[PDB]
């Protein structure tokens, strides 16, 4: 089964990530329908030396063919035993012309961020992609969020001056960064605690705090539409403008005060789904913080560490912290999709069935291990910085 140039007019802009551009079947053929295609873009061999090293306990994951496989069999092998198959589906091969990649790319040039278009295309050295279902399809409202990571470090391995890393959240920390850096306008308002906290009344202010400033942590599609949230990116404050849209958007759906009922029922499905459990027991696979697991880092990539207990480890210990360090980046950078047709909507006395997926699941590179340390690191010192304004 292989795609050529023909198709690439069949599919359509959904958006992206750093490592990926989603487009949605509006073709006609019973293979694709309600599909989305995953394809990977090279920023400006399937696995390294040393990689294969760090996964050597994994017959297949080592031996995949191309980096498609390489998604496939990641999420399947490592992280299907972890989540549970009712919510992850790792999704099929499908081989693609370089012509088609070619011309998808061109295509859609037009529909995202250009800051995305600046630093990636689609990778066109690539004979295949990753089909996965269109979880936006069950009028389907359909919510994405990226939790992000939803608890405090308690490392030893945390140094005295750093110790604010252990009271405030990493994504609260990183706002401020994000700000001098002006990739978002305001703060978010958006706090995982409260969404990964587990009480009822929390998990809703969290939904609320989603809707008044979503960035890239909250989308909310129709018919597979975006109609909240940026597309490929972030997005400013939802004024009263885009709430009124919003408003008018959940004209019918819902039967109302439309967008009250529409947190709260997204709200109650999260919370009675109890899916963040699992996610936040898999974030937590990070049991030392970069700050610890760096070191294990250095070992695993037979180097002398630059950043001096650790390094006495037993190497199959170090290759298990590592491991689990990035199954965990894995879990802490994912998104859930929760789509909409079972929660109960008290006032208008409605009811809706719901299905929840994980998205953007992603096979963290190890040589990231660097990058992650360097950027923890400035996220610190610019907060304990401006904590020193007082
Ligand atoms: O480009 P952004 O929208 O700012 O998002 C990126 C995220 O992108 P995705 O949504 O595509 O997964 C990165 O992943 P990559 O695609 O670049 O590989 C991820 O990097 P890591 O998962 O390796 O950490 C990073 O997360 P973080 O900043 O926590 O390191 C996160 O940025 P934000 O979530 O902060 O926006
Ligand atoms: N299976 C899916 N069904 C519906 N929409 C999806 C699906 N996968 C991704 N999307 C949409 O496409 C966007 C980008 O896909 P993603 O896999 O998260 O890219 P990246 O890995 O680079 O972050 C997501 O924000 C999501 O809204
Ligand atoms: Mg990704
Ligand atoms: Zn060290």
């Given at each position: 089964?292989?795609?050529?140039?023909?198709?690439?007019?069949?599919?359509?802009?959904?958006?992206?990530?750093?490592?990926?551009?989603?487009?949605?079947?509006?073709?006609?053929?019973?293979?694709?329908?309600?599909?989305?295609?995953?394809?990977?873009?090279?920023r400006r061999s399937v696995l390294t030396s040393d990689e294969?090293?760090?996964?050597?306990?994994?017959?297949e994951l080592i031996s995949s063919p191309n980096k498609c496989?390489?998604?496939?069999?990641?999420?399947?092998?490592?992280?299907?035993?972890?989540?549970?198959?009712?919510?992850?589906?790792?999704?099929?091969?499908?081989?693609?012309?370089?012509?088609?990649?070619?011309?998808?790319?061109?295509?859609?040039?037009?529909?995202?961020?250009?800051?995305?278009?600046?630093?990636?295309?689609?990778?066109?050295?690539?004979?295949?992609?990753?089909?996965?279902?269109?979880?936006?399809?069950?009028?389907?409202?359909?919510?994405?969020?990226?939790?992000?990571?939803?608890?405090?470090?308690?490392?030893?391995?945390?140094?005295?001056?750093?110790?604010?890393?252990?009271?405030?959240?990493?994504?609260?920390?990183?706002?401020?960064?994000?700000?001098?850096?002006?990739?978002?306008?305001?703060?978010?308002?958006?706090?995982?605690?409260?969404?990964?906290?587990?009480?009822?009344?929390?998990?809703?202010?969290?939904?609320?705090?989603?809707?008044?400033?979503?960035?890239?942590?909250?989308?909310?599609?129709?018919?597979?539409?975006?109609?909240?949230?940026?597309?490929?990116?972030?997005?400013?404050?939802?004024?009263?403008?885009?709430?009124?849209?919003?408003?008018?958007?959940?004209?019918?759906?819902?039967?109302?005060?439309?967008?009250?009922?529409?947190?709260?029922?997204?709200?109650?499905?999260?919370?009675?789904?109890?899916?963040?459990?699992?996610?936040?027991?898999?974030?937590?696979?990070?049991?030392?913080?970069?700050?610890?697991?760096?070191?294990?880092?250095?070992?695993?990539?037979?180097?002398?560490?630059?950043?001096?207990?650790?390094?006495?480890?037993?190497?199959?210990?170090?290759?298990?912290?590592?491991?689990?360090?990035?199954?965990?980046?894995?879990?802490?950078?994912?998104?859930?999709?929760?789509?909409?047709?079972?929660?109960?909507?008290?006032?208008?006395?409605?009811?809706?069935?719901?299905?929840?997926?994980?998205?953007?699941?992603?096979?963290?590179?190890?040589?990231?291990?660097?990058s992650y340390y360097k950027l923890d690191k400035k996220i610190?010192?610019?907060?304990?910085?401006?904590?020193?304004?007082?």
């Amino acid at each position: 089964m292989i795609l050529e140039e023909k198709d690439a007019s069949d599919w359509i802009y959904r958006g992206e990530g750093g490592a990926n551009l989603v487009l949605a079947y509006a073709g006609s053929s019973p293979l694709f329908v309600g599909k989305v295609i995953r394809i990977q873009k090279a920023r400006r061999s399937v696995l390294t030396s040393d990689e294969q090293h760090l996964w050597r306990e994994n017959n297949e994951l080592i031996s995949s063919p191309n980096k498609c496989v390489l998604e496939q069999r990641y999420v399947q092998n490592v992280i299907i035993p972890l989540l549970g198959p009712k919510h992850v589906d790792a999704g099929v091969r499908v081989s693609v012309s370089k012509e088609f990649l070619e011309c998808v790319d061109k295509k859609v040039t037009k529909q995202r961020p250009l800051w995305r278009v600046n630093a990636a295309n689609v990778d066109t050295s690539h004979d295949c992609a990753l089909i996965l279902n269109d979880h936006s399809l069950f009028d389907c409202i359909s919510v994405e969020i990226k939790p992000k990571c939803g608890f405090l470090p308690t490392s030893r391995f945390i140094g005295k001056e750093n110790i604010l890393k252990t009271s405030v959240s990493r994504f609260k920390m990183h706002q401020l960064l994000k700000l001098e850096y002006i990739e978002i306008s305001e703060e978010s308002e958006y706090d995982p605690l409260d969404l990964f906290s587990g009480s009822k009344e929390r998990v809703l202010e969290a939904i609320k705090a989603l809707y008044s400033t979503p960035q890239n942590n909250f989308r909310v599609f129709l018919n597979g539409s975006l109609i909240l949230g940026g597309s490929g990116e972030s997005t400013g404050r939802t004024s009263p403008e885009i709430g009124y849209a919003f408003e008018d958007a959940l004209k019918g759906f819902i039967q109302s005060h439309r967008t009250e009922c529409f947190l709260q029922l997204v709200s109650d499905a999260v919370y009675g789904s109890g899916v963040l459990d699992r996610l936040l027991e898999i974030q937590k696979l990070d049991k030392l913080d970069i700050e610890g697991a760096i070191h294990c880092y250095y070992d695993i990539i037979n180097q002398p560490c630059p950043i001096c207990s650790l390094h006495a480890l037993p190497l199959d210990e170090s290759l298990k912290i590592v491991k689990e360090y990035l199954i965990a980046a894995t879990a802490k950078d994912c998104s859930i999709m929760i789509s909409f047709q079972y929660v109960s909507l008290k006032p208008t006395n409605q009811t809706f069935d719901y299905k929840v997926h994980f998205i953007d699941l992603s096979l963290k590179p190890l040589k990231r291990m660097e990058s992650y340390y360097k950027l923890d690191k400035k996220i610190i010192s610019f907060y304990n910085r401006k904590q020193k304004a007082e």
